[PDB]
Amino acid sequence: VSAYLSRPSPFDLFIRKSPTITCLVVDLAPSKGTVNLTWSRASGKPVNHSTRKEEKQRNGTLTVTSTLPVGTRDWIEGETYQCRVTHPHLPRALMRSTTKTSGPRAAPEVYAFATPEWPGSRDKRTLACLIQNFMPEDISVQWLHNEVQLPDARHSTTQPRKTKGSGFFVFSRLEVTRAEWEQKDEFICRAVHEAASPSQTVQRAVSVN
């Protein structure tokens, strides 16, 4: 049995303005009676109304998730949310904690390029985005085709690595089709990051021509 506690995404936290944190228990067989997983805040303020859900996977394991909403202001003011899983089959309890990452704060700077056409693939082009010198490391990257949000599948982004200097960086690749850029040749690589000012957003616009 394992248990994982996610943080709210910068996107969920600054754009949707509906942040939630999920506590995920995995690898469990239905086995003895189901597992109890409760919450606590460092402030001692009470916990909202949390939703539980059970799912049985192909491999026969049980995925039990509990989702808890958070107030964006609560999160930034520096609250600490803690999840605790108990099971009869487990002697002691699993505990996962999450909170706003401490440290300096620098907003990300963003650069976007298009790749030169390659022989044999005239109809696909690749657009690249490098986002760097931001901290803390939490970031959300999304691609738009002129104010049309693209599915998060369409792009692949690297996990943040720590540069030689003081910021982090991420690198994002988006493969766009000829039909997309001939109808409209504007593509937006956008970063959502808590230091970005204002509205927690930085973006560049990139064209195939």
Partner: antibody, heavy 120, light 113 residues
């Protein structure tokens, strides 16, 4: 950042009474957490004396129940330790501390520099 | 009538880079709900304690990973994997299981010499 400052120490007479004060700045003592008084006799152990939660619930150590009283002042973001019938066994350094909450249990994540109480 | 905490050793000497192990023993169990409510504090002289570990094994934020806690029931241990110059302090355990909250008497960790 939460900051805590004790005041109200000094040389004091036995059998008298004294009010220590904890002036909190940077967080509101009605927004969350537990607010404690913990004392330390010279080169001896720490003793938990009294607490008040952000929601007003109070708790005491039986060793001082009756003669010690804990109150707060929403307006002044301060809280108080009222001690009556001071004894020699009360001479110590009194720390105020902000307790953080773990599933109905408290730990003392923030303290202040301390104030000294001495009873001739 | 309260819960008593005995720490051992009372006092010890080590050198930078050593591994130090401190023991806290509670007069009765401090377990409930699959957790152990033993906390570990560091106090340098003339200063107020600093919280290191809560609930036996969980690190307070900003605490170097070299501090670790473990134990259950009435036997708990604080382990400093690699002593450092700033780590020379008196160390307290305190149980948060049952009122009134109680502290151990402390373990003085002094530099060799």
């Amino acid at each position: 950042e939460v900051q805590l400052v004790e005041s109200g120490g000094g040389l004091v007479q036995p059998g008298g009474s004294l009010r220590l004060s904890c002036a909190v700045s940077g967080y509101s003592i009605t927004s969350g957490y537990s607010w404690n008084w913990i004392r330390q006799a010279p080169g001896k152990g720490l003793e938990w004396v009294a607490s008040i939660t952000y929601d007003g619930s109070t708790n005491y150590n039986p060793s001082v129940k009756g003669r010690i009283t804990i109150s707060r002042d929403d307006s002044k973001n301060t809280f108080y330790l009222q001690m009556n019938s001071l004894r020699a066994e009360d001479t110590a350094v009194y720390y105020c501390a902000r307790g953080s909450h773990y599933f109905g249990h408290w730990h003392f994540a923030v303290w202040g520099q301390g104030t000294l109480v001495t009873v001739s | 009538s309260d819960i008593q905490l005995t720490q051992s050793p009372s006092s010890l000497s080590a050198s930078v880079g050593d591994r130090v192990t401190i023991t806290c023993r509670a007069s009765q169990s401090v377990d409930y709900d699959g957790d152990s409510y033993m906390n570990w504090y560091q106090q340098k002289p003339g200063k107020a304690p600093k919280l290191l570990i809560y609930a036996a094994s969980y690190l307070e934020s900003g605490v170097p990973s070299r501090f670790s806690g473990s134990g259950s029931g009435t036997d708990f241990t604080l382990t400093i994997s690699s002593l450092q110059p700033e780590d020379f302090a008196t160390y307290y355990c305190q149980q948060s299981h049952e009122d009134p909250y109680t502290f151990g008497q402390g373990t003085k960790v002094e530099i060799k010499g």
